[PDB]
């Protein structure tokens, strides 16, 4: 009953411990093992419950395969919950997969605490199953997909406990006054962040006492800078100090039964765009259950206008019945009924792993109380993927099923839709989370499986544990082995039509594979997918989207939130157009002597860290392999003072064992957490003034105290083992086993019988107090002590490579005790390995369901690539966060327009084409004769190759040029054999001699 | 009038408007109150990503108004 943070660790930190320790004793009970059901079962049993069972006895038919990947066209006739067991089983060993045989004995629910019903139930059972549910106190979740369009509902019952709504870190901050009304002053500038009903407690307020007994204060907002709680007069009276930490209060919340949403539903709304949608597609989600009651169970004929007219009926009926639903005088919406209609038997890959991704979810907030629950009703459409029917027309033949797996498919979209699907040419930049994700959405839809269609994969990366839990076509067998190839291979599995059609590779896509990912490469693909990890990475392929002019879907998470982009040529805006908000930089002098953080202790341990372990042994290789090294350094170097220090260092106290590297690690202990603290507050005592006559040490500045090393603490204990181990591991010294615990004793013995230098301060040394502020025979010294190189002939350091996910390595160890004995010099609460292994490590957040949910969405944008749709109020940028649950829907921004000379061009997508190497004084020429244009500038990325204030020698070097010998001229290296094409920039004044912006230059060599 | 602004996080900003003020104007508002530069700033209302020297009114925002702001993620 304690978490695998090896398999959970990129969750872990999305749901947390109670969270997902309150999963693992939930059974979930899924009712429908069709596309939703199975996607639903995916992501909780990768989520981690303590058990999944699913009921579907219902045979396997081939069209069942339009969006149930786990089934294939050999199970047809076996039943769906049987056949299905085995695959949702090997997704995760930790959580048994049961199948229920009937569901006859409805009090069999009993043994569950949360029942999901998805598109195979009926209503009328439904609403009986929801009130067995509802009064028994089982959670009730239902979904169901109906071609384009989808809904869900969410019943947790009369008392449901919401233990932490958003799943935010908790805000905190420093004091600097609170008067006795209780109005909070913050420190400087610093921004509360807090909101109206926001409750607060309080740390080292002086003056007040019991304010920081744990007792929260409800929070009135007064502006960005301050708060009230309330009068603090009994309290007390301010005088210094304070920090305020954010308290989310649990909160009970009621939910009515399916029975009283159906005639008074709360919606949650999944595009504000199409409010107005829900109220008509809740009366048309029932009346195709009425309808199936009419029709022995039957849905609406594909594209049949009599159906459809008489679903317009039911609603209409079903409005009068059900008055506060649409309200008065508000019409059916009979257009969007009839689409219902149309679509009713249709299912959409996309749609499914939309509403799949966020039940799944709210099946996990059920089971722990984790983020707000959906509350109750969610109705959604992407009408907008359907293509113009003037390109594809939709009627009853060209809908007509034709006995396959895309029947269901083509019910929407119509038969040479899906051809057209097929015959796509696609590139996948990325093969994990969202790369996984998207190869089965794209093994669903076929996609690439036509003779003129195929699939292009690639991921340098390998799989790894961490990457099982939300990359479900790996198996713990896969481990080690290519991503992308491993990819492949499985959604092959699931749709032998992209056997021979998925080329999978393992090349990184940035400028150093430009020669695989060429000119003829690129041109021949209909779009681009991004599924990464980084900006960078997106940033690159952008730019080559918007060179090659190809539409780009772009996509992203992080835990519960996500987002996609379209980026469509000569229509909308680049990623690139575009800023996101950077990381936010600590202060030097915060990290070097004033942390109040624990992320400033974790960075100053992590650079320590790399300074002892691996810039240390890199130095000191150079040195001995490089003859020019040392004075190099002299020559080039930020810190000359250290780096020549570090080589001393490691070389005058090299380890010749175990023990001294103990020694050693005890002696940096005292160094790091006791000397240069000591030193610190030699310089500035703990009563020391500023000359306004305030305390030095207050707000942001915590008087530190020395540590004593005390083997007895965990934080003291670990840094010496840790530290003496890696420097062991630098200097080749064996430890006394690697898998074996160490012991407190042993290091003991080491340590007591060390003698401490007593610390005695330098009375010469300047502390920097603020980044704004100021701050060589001494070095002559250092250089002359440095040990001849010969002497020391075939030694070799071992540099240390930071591997977060190893926990046997000793590198979290080292940072998270480091860190920790910095944080208690400074007061500062210590943090556990997988929180530093979360900041040090940089670790994403990372969650199926929002993968799932995030890919299903590019998935709706993809069909409109298919139709080559150019109005761009079709498209949809997509935003989540399931923690609310927020969904929200923006048209793309249109690229911006320019002119020059009277000419219109796109800033983004519009260049000139040259053709040859041409000389730079015919390109100046051409400018000016062709385009009205004089060129003022030229670059070739970094170098400047022209500009119009070159005097005329300089002119005379350079006028002459083909471009290429101009590039080499200032770069010295000159273009690679390979490129077949370069990009120039050129800044230029118009015909008035006045400075226009001008598209960039294109060479065809 | 006032509007609000709801953050991914969840939280609410309330804001004085106009009619007429522009995308710039508010979001400088926005950035008082919660320190987020105008470049960081993706607003959308209605369907709509909320440009630039456009007004208020030109995307038809109400008294009582909900605006969202969105981010873009790198997860993948």
Known sequence: ?????????????????????????????????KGLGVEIAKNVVLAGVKSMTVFDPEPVQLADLSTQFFLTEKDIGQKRGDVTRAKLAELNAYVPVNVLDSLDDVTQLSQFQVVVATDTVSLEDKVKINEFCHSSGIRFISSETRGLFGNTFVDLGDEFTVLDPTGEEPRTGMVSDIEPDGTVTMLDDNRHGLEDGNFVRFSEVEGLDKLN????????????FAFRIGSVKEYGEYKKGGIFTEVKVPR?????????????????????????????????????????????????????????????????????????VLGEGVDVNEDLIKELSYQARGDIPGVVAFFGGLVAQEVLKACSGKFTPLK???????????????????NEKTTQPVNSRYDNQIAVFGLDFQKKIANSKVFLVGSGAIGCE?????????????????????????????????????????????????????????????????????????????????????????????????????????????????????????????????????????????????????????????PNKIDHTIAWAKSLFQGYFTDSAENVNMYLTQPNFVEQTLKQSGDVKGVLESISDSLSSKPHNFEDCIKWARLEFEKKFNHDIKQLLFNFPKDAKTSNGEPFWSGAKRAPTPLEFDIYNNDHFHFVVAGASLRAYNYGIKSDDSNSKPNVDEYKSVIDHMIIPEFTPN????????????????????????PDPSTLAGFKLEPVDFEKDDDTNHHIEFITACSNCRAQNYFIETADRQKTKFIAGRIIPAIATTTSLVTGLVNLELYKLIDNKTDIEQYKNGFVNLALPFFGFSEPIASPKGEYNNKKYDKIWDRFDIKGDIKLSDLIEHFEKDEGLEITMLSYGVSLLYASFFPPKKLKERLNLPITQLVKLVTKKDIPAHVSTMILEICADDKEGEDVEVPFITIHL | MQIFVKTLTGKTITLEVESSDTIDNVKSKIQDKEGIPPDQQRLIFAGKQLEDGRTLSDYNIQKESTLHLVLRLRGG
């Open chain 1, 1 to 33: 009953g304690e978490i695998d943070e090896s398999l959970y660790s990129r969750q872990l930190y999305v749901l947390g411990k109670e969270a997902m320790l309150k999963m693992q004793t939930s059974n979930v009970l899924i009712l429908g093992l």
């Open chain 1, 213 to 224: 007994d744990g007792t929260l204060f409800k929070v009135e907002v007064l502006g960005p």
């Open chain 1, 252 to 324: 009970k919340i009621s939910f009515k039964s399916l029975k009283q949403q159906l005639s008074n539903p709360e919606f949650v709304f999944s595009d504000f765009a199409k409010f107005d949608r829900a109220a008509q597609l809740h009366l048309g989600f029932q009346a195709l259950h009425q309808f199936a009651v009419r029709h022995n169970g039957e849905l609406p004929r594909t594209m049949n206008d009599e159906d459809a007219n008489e679903l317009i009926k039911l609603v209409t009926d079903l409005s009068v019945q059900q008055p506060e």
């Open chain 1, 376 to 394: 109750q009703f969610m109705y959604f459409d992407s009408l907008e993927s359907l293509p113009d029917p003037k390109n594809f027309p939709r």
């Open chain 1, 438 to 594: 998207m190869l089965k959405n794209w093994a669903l839809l076929g996609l690439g499986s036509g003779s003129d269609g195929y699939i292009v994969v690639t991921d340098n990366d390998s799989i790894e544990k961490s990457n099982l839990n939300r990359q479900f076509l790996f198996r713990p067998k896969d481990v080690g082995k290519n991503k992308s190839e491993v990819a492949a291979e499985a959604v092959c599995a699931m749709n032998p039509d992209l056997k021979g059609k998925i080329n999978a590779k393992i090349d990184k896509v940035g400028p150093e594979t430009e020669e695989i990912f060429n000119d003829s490469f690129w041109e021949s693909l209909d779009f681009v997918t991004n599924a990464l990890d980084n900006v960078d990475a997106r940033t690159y392929v952008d730019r080559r989207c918007v060179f090659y002019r190809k539409p780009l879907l772009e996509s992203g998470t992080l835990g519960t939130k996500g987002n996609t982009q379209v980026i469509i040529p000569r229509l909308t805006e680049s990623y690139s157009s575009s800023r996101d908000p950077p990381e936010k930089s600590i202060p030097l002098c915060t990290l070097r002597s004033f």
């Open chain 1, 763 to 786: 009375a010469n040394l300047k502390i920097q107090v603020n980044d704004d502020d100021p701050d060589s025979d001494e070095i002559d010294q250092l250089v002359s002590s440095l």
